[PDB]
Symmetry: C2
Subunit: 469 residues, 2 copies
Amino acid sequence: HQSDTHIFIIMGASGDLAKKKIYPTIWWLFRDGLLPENTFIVGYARSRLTVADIRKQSEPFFKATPEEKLKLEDFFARNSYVAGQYDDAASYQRLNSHMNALHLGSQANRLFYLALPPTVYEAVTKNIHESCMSQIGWNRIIVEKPFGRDLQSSDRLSNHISSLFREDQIYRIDHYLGKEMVQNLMVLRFANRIFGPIWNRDNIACVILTFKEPFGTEGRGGYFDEFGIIRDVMQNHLLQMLCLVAMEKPASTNSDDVRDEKVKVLKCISEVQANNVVLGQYVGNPDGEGEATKGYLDDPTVPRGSTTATFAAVVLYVENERWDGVPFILRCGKALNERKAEVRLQFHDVAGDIFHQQCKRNELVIRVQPNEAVYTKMMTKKPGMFFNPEESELDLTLPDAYERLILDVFCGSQMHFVRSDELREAWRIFTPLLHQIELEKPKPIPYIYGSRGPTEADELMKRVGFQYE
Amino acid sequence: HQSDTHIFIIMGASGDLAKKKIYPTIWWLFRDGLLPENTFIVGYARSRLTVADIRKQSEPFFKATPEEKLKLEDFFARNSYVAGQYDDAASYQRLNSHMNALHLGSQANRLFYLALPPTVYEAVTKNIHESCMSQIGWNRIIVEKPFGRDLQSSDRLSNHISSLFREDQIYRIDHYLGKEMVQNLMVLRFANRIFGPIWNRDNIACVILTFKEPFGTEGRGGYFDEFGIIRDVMQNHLLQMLCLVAMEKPASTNSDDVRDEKVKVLKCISEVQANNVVLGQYVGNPDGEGEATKGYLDDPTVPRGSTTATFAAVVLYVENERWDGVPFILRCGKALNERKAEVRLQFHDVAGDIFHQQCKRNELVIRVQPNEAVYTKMMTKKPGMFFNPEESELDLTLPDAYERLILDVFCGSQMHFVRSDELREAWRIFTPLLHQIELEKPKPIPYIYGSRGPTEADELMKRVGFQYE
């Protein structure tokens, strides 16, 4: 994918999401030439702007340097902007004409990016499929989360998008996915007989899937209330972790095979009520800071009396022979004590204790971020004149995660993007939970800003059987 | 064992073995005070000497400094010497009287050290049992290798020693044993479900037990001939490695249980034929600088036309449910390429190769010496944009081995010393082969001083199933 021209159409160029994360990401990719050499960027938005205005409002987040001002002005040499509405065939045809009025725009692999408001996904995708299809190269679409709110809405959206594009063209992206050691966990799991056969019900006691954040929801508090942590990260990213941990032997490790194993695991998950769900929400930190002094409900853009949770702890199980009866854990949140993303595989104790109850349950952490590291906290003898062992952390282990994911979109690798049927089954899993949520509006348990999360989650892992040192 | 007085009776104080290795070892242990505070040394030999003569003849090897000259003279302040023959009750009673004429010599735990020549073991042990027994404290002895030559001689000698002392008062020592990395193998085997359940026939492909020595037998070539590498290191040290690796369901880590499981494993191995044997012997190096210019047969003290081997590779296959049908490899020798003592636990390949045959058989090396270190050469993905793994050496990891074994003899820990019945069964499984050896005088295959050993050993590893990459 380094020869044929590509177009990275950023719908919503004036959008805050674009200007804050997408344009700086493609700048990072373009200063180092990770995108293909003949890469075009064609923004699009309602507001009538220009390339100079884009420069003026986006340079500070690009944070370029006088050393590579030349590379910067080459980066804007590939840029362009188109003005139009989101539901009008006239402006859509104008966008198509502008795209075709480039270096083989029709031949260019139009890699659409939907950074536009969530309320229009249906209409924008319908217009894109009707008018903005190039019949030469692949036309992938990047749909940003979330993909509906409950089972019925998600099914309708998925069926519409399936009737428009095929799954080879739909790319459901997840920003938080590391893709660096979510990829290394696969190698560790498959290329070992040390971890291979003990990847079953008898040996691995449980799996803890954690994704914490150090910052709250300052400013953009009006986007999280309608959605909730479950639909934001818990149902997409934590299920991605759970599926890539619980998947059976793919036997060909391709994207389709791994997603099919994900579908098999998910189809092997029974219904989940509130009995395996815990919710939590944060409030003002008494030891305040520049942004910690105000809680979630202190954000003026958040509607008063909103029961949207920012912490979700759920336990899943897989009803197949390899994973029969063995538990899995999902934990996440925002504004927690410290940024982290780990997958702790706690193994069973060896049947028959001989070190006088000193045997600690062997672990295997995959700390996706920050300071990426994989380590097995196995236990070995301490040097000296003794015999007793000590639990020791044994380390076993570069574009950023988001630009790596965009590069994977360019390459065509759909390993880490949820499938239509995978999403359908995933929503089927939590349909009772989501219906209860939208019916009764459950009240999450308050927790302190920058804490470790509600104690009910740790109690949930304890009920599962997870052992905390 | 820091209050009651101890005596380290070095029979053969004028002996070369004593003056070269035992007295410097107890000096190393005494400058740091690892012997009990009220420890005594009472040598003994045919030739008449004195403490000053011992000082003059043994000072240079202590490699001490004038700063610790005070500690050295304190170390010789507790030394002693008794003159007498090895087979005379009169001199034995003189020795006993000298012992009783000390600071509670009768109460002292006489820790005898049979460093005296092998040809007299029967008579010396009989006299020691008859006369030199203190009836107050424990009276252990350290019996040095080899423990007989064939099945019948070994059985007679072991039965006599059993009739004299119980198995609590016998220590079949093995200098080469590390006592540290062997000690960590036990922990790595027991305190993990990472290695525990896969410690069976289906997962561990084979085990390689290796022990090499860069220096030959210059000068002392008249000692190795009558014994052979099998009876020197293979049948003691390499079988100790095999028992520690293979023993089933050890139970309490105590000496009794570990040695019982050693007995069970050795009862679960059948007779060794000539078909599982490789022998080798070394010759001089044209390119060598020091001793390498002369080979084993170049030693004037070696009888001409001697077929004693210095390299022996024999594989065992323990026949019980946990280890049914597995290869266990023994490799050893002298004058090899470089010092080493490793246990390479090569596991099976995962059934179903999905990384396009990039999967290398997972290993686990336990380097006993030099530079003790455990590293699992497991395979993980190297950082990059490709979904490919790399075989990476992942490290897992203080007197020396002889000091720690002497301390073990002082403490009473008999986990590292071969048992009477264990020795009987090892000689029973080597009986047909050893009788054929003594009958036909097999000719070992020549190999180069300082090489890696005869190629037939690697052929043996390949035949049993060991994979070399």
